[model samples]
Target: MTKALFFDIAGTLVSFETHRIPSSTIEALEAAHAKGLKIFIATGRPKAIINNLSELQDRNLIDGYITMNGAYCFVGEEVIYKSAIPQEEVKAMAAFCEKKGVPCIFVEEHNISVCQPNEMVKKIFYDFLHVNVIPTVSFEEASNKEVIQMTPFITEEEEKEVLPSIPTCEIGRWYPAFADVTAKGDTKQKGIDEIIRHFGIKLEETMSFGDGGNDISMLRHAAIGVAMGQAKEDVKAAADYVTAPIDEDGISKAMKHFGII
Candidate 1:
């Protein structure tokens, strides 16, 4: 039996334009829940942003969340597992970005994310993220809590310079204008493995859906790896199945085919 279903947030669960769950998708989730299937969200989004998913929270449909590409994992209010970037690395990166005038955002577990001191960066963040983001004078002033990941907004050339400096940390660009830096061994696949072990379930019993480079590992680990129709060719090539486009109810259609409805 399919014990759990993991979904990507941006393209799988919520759309870019609507920013709301589609009725068909909701119906599928509701049906899955009724059949005792655990529903979870796995995304590269930070915990702070994931908390804003009030619709899912309100409906109590999400059983677990793997956020920041697996830097943190939670089942309801219970934290199953979490990982953080070393303070030394954070400080070094902060200094580098500060010197380069690159915008940065720190993601702390269960706390608001902190953006850099640049006003232009703030505006660009708002424009692309479509969410309320508060600015911080400096990364040190943000919070004392452990930081899961640091997203630095830099140009391609600057990224090349900065990434090599932090060779110990995993550094990659998810968007053209931003790079995500996290500790080694912290990834969605790690979080999924933790969840699987905690529940005493086999990996073959899980189905994962995603559309990004960061989602590649977990997609490959799942028994049924579903790539979004709108995903890049490389990402789609890694999946066991490909569904319709995100705007066209790809998830819903895939679930129907699997008899999840």
Candidate 2:
């Protein structure tokens, strides 16, 4: 029997456009919960943003979260694991992005994320995120925040230039025009491994889902990895199963197919 179910956030739980959680998906989650199967969110999002997924958290549908592409792990109110960018690395990366006129956001330990001051960057940031964002007047002003990851918006050419400058960091491009830089060796697999160890479960019994490049590691490692139907070709190639688009209750369909819901 499956002891736990891991889900991706954007393309697995909610759609990128509508951002609506379907009723069938909710019922499937509730059904999994009823069977004592622990439900965990494994996503590239920061831990702070995961806390704001009130619809899932308020209903106790998610038992834990692997955030920042696996930089941190949390079980309910307890942080089971955490990894942060060194202060020196954080300062250097921030300065580099600021100099390149890139829009950037620093994710803190909790419900806090700060962006650099740039009207154009801010506009694009809000347009893509479609949410209220807290802005820092200067990158230096955000030095005190415990930054786990720094996401900078830049073109492919700019990324090529900027990525190589931070050799000690793990740079991931989840979107075409943006990349997130975190400490090296910090990944979703790290968090997932910790969870499996904590529960004394085998890797073969764990399933993972995602729709981004950063998810490649987890998708390749999990026993039954699932990719969204709308995912990129590379992402789809890394999974053992493919489900419907997020808007069509893909998660529910996957759950039913696995006989877990």
Candidate 3:
């Protein structure tokens, strides 16, 4: 039996089409919680921009968070695990973005800032994702801080070229617009290990749901990894099972299939 559940936010829990969690998904979570399963959100998003899950949060359904691709994780007010990219790596990535005239979003423990603001950036975050991002600090200042993640708007080729500068970090791209860079070992799988240890649960007693490249780690780490129907082929290949899309009662269906609901 699964005692815990970890979910990716954008494509797994919240629909990219409507930017809202479907009614069935909410019902499914309630059912899972009622069945005594603890729920957590594991996402590449920083805490400041995680604004879409208010309904679920208001119900007290979520138990913890693995934010910034697992650079920071916490249960209520207590931190379970955390990691930050090396400061030199952060500076190098930030400088590279600046030199290339590419946009980059710096994620720190308490703040989020964008280095360049372009129409594509606004379109992706404001229009498409509906995230209200407010850039507060400059890239130079952010690089000096304990940065957790750096989202640089660049293509796969650029990602490859720039990666060597930040050898202590790794990158994952779910959206073609930008790649998420975090500390080398700060993965959702690591977050799961920490959270499960805190709750005294074994890895075999956990399940996970995701549909993005960043979700691959936790999906594979979980005992029963579920991929949504809309996930990429590679993401699906990483999972043990595939369910319907977010709009088609995917979470509920997967829960019922596993006898967890």
Candidate 4:
């Protein structure tokens, strides 16, 4: 039996197009909760701005979080694991984004701020993702802060140029507009290991669902990894099974297929 379920947010549990978690998925989780299974959200997003998962959260269905691409993992108010990008790398990337005029969102434990807010930032964070991104801190202030992740608004090609500067850091992305930068080896897979150890559960008793490139590691680590149908081919190839799209009841379908719910 599966003791826990790890689900990626956008494109896995919540549809990017709708910006909403389907009712069927919610019901499926409810049923899973009834069976005494722990539910976790494993995403590249930070804890403060995760507005989409409240439906599950309000109902007390979510058991834990692996946020900022696993740089921070927590259960309720207790942190299971926390990692920070090297301070030098944070300062370097902050300066790099400043030089390039690229907007970079810096994520700390209790705060999130953008280096410079622009139209693209507005489009991506506000319009597209439907979250209000408040850049309350200056770039220099953020550079000195203990940042867990930095999201530079740059394409894959641009990321290649920026990545070399932060040798100790790595990038993960579900959206093409930007990439999440964190310390090397801090990933969702690492988060899962930390979580299971804290809960005293075996690795074989865990299941995971995802639909992005960043989700590859955890998906591969889970006993029964499931990829959403609309996921990229490479992501799908990493999973043990591919369920229907999120809008098409993918989570429920996969849970049912595995007899978890």
Q: Candidate 4 — which residues are off by over 4 angstroms?
A: none
List model 1 lDDT by residue over 202-236, tens digit each. 89899999877777888899888899898888779
TM-score of each model, in listed order = 0.90, 0.91, 0.97, 0.97
Candidate 4 clashing pairs, residues 3+ apart or interchain: none
Q: Between the candidate structures 1 and 2, which one is better when assessed by TM-score?
A: 2
Q: Which residue segments of model 3 deviate by more than 4 Å?
A: none
- The digit string of per-residue lDDT tens for model 4 on 156-186 reads 8888887778898868987788889989899
Question: How many backbone clashes are present in model 2?
Answer: 0
lDDT of 2: 0.76
lDDT string, candidate 3, 116-176, tens digits: 7677678888899998966756668867887888888888888888878978787877888
| Candidate 1 Cα errors over 4 Å, as ranges | 113-124, 140-145
Highest lDDT: which candidate? 4
The candidate 3 region of ten consecutive residues with least summed lDDT is: 133-142
Give candidates' CA RMSD values in order. Answer: 2.3, 2.1, 1.0, 1.1
Candidate 4: worst 10 consecutive residues by lDDT?
A: 130-139
> CA shift at 13, candidate 1, in angstroms?
1.3
What overall lDDT goes with each candidate model?
0.76, 0.76, 0.89, 0.90
- Arrange candidates by TM-score, highest first: which order? 3, 4, 2, 1
Worst 10 residues of 2 by lDDT: 121-130
